[PDB]
């Protein structure tokens, strides 16, 4: 769960700093690579985060992060 938490923390910070909660699938993958997250199946790792509520699909390739922000 530490890995998923670290990944969500990264998305939360990107969204806060950029005033933008939209991420394409491959952009999520690039962030995961930068954090050295290695999972068996990235698609269903993302799918699990969708199931948990962190990401909502906006079409099959794009996601909206569900987060509080400060700005």
Resolution (A): 1.2
Query: From CA 7, how far away is CA 55, in angstroms rounded?
Result: 12
Tell me if 63 sits within 8 A of 25, measured CB to CB.
yes
The number of distinct structural domains making up the chain is 1
- Using alpha carbons only, how large is the chain's radius of gyration in Å? 11
For residue 25, give every residue at least 6 positions away whose Cβ sits within 8 Å of its Cβ, in sequence order, or none: 43, 46, 61, 62, 63
Q: Would you state the torsion angle of the CA atoms of residues 52, 29, 10, 70, taken in this order, to the nearest 10 degrees? A: -70
Question: Rounded to whole angstroms, what are the CA distances from 59 to 3, 15, 16, 38, 62?
Answer: 26, 19, 23, 25, 6
Method underlying the structure: X-ray
Query: From CA 7, how far away is CA 35, in angstroms rounded?
Result: 8
Query: From CA 65, how far away is CA 46, in angstroms rounded?
Result: 11
Structure tokens at 23: 């991420």
User: Which range of residues forms the domain containing residue 45?
Assistant: 1-71
């Amino acid at each position: 769960r530490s890995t998923a938490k670290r990944f969500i923390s990264a998305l939360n910070n990107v969204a806060e700093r950029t005033y933008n909660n939209i991420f394409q699938f491959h952009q999520l993958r690039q962030i995961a690579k930068e954090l050295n997250i290695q999972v068996a199946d990235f698609e269903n790792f993302i799918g699990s985060l969708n199931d948990q509520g962190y990401l909502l699909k906006k079409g099959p390739k794009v996601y909206q992060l569900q987060t509080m922000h400060h700005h």
